[PDB]
Amino acid sequence: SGGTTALPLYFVGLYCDKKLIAEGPGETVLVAEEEAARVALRKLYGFTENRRPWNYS
């Protein structure tokens, strides 16, 4: 959204043989790709935002 303006939004999605493995936002396409890499790394390393919270009990 907003390709030409000064406040764009690009949602870049990595793929692995026709299957998604991440999706990232950004303002530049480069930054969106970087963030897609970061989210994919988090998903593969099991450190997502909604991981099973540590069990203190």
Partner: protein, 156 residues
């Protein structure tokens, strides 16, 4: 009866006819079993619950804080369980009570970390020309409940 097509014969909404209940009950049982088998194997992550408390409905999740404006006659750091869970949800499934969830299906634990008195609040009344001016200072007490765990069990 028959009426030739016009702009008002039928209303402008679609004729939505619901599925036959005999098959719908089977479908509901199947999806319920699917969600249950998700719960049994640990196929979920962080959880969130809509807990009903002092009079309010708090949307909470593990490790978060809540501030109740009424003293709860509990020592500092005494674990408690919050009944009255209205909705508990994970990434892929969420369970809705009618209106509460059973005591067995959901278990929400909280702890009392701080009891204090809120910041001073002012109550001032004034009316013009009648010499009516009065000022009061109120400090309602309050307590901070940390939520320690939302655990779920495969009882569906």
């Amino acid at each position: 009866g028959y009426v030739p097509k016009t702009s008002l014969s039928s209303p402008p909404w679609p004729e939505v006819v619901l599925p036959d209940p005999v098959e719908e009950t089977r479908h509901h049982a199947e999806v319920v079993k699917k969600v249950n088998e998700m719960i049994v194997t640990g196929q979920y992550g962080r959880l969130f619950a809509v807990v009903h408390f002092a009079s309010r409905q708090w949307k909470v999740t593990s490790e978060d804080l809540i501030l109740i404006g009424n003293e709860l006659d509990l020592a500092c750091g005494e674990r408690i369980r919050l009944e009255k869970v209205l909705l508990v949800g994970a990434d892929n499934f969420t369970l809705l009570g009618k209106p509460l969830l059973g005591k067995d299906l959901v278990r929400v634990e909280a702890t009392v970390i701080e009891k204090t008195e809120s910041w001073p609040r002012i109550i001032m009344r004034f009316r013009k020309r009648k010499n009516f001016k009065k000022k009061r200072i109120v400090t309602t007490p309050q307590t901070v409940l940390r939520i320690n765990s939302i655990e779920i069990a495969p009882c569906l």
